[PDB]
Nucleic acid binder design. Sequence first.
RNA 1: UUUUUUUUUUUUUUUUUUUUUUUUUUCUCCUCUUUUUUUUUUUU
Length: 71
Amino acid sequence: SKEEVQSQGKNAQKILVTPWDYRIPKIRISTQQAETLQDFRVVVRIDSWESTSVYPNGHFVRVLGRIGDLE
RNA sequence: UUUUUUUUUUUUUUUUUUUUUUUUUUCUCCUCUUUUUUUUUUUU
């Protein structure tokens, strides 16, 4: 959310993402558009689970629809 | 009744070349609660 992105900096490489089913952990990915996609569902993938992190790594894949409209 | 003389616009042209997007950082990060997980069946 915004008030916790304006504090990430404004060129915040690393970011944390919240999945949609409770069965999945959170994923560590690096992007540079977080401050203009805060009203959209997105898609990510997974490349490697690393042990010096508590989370698994990923990378953005493609955009999805908008949170609020049926589509 | 007032003669004679005091030069002028720098000279030159017939020289070789075998490279190549960019370029250089920012850390670890507590996801709250009825559950085992339901399940045949038929009309698309």
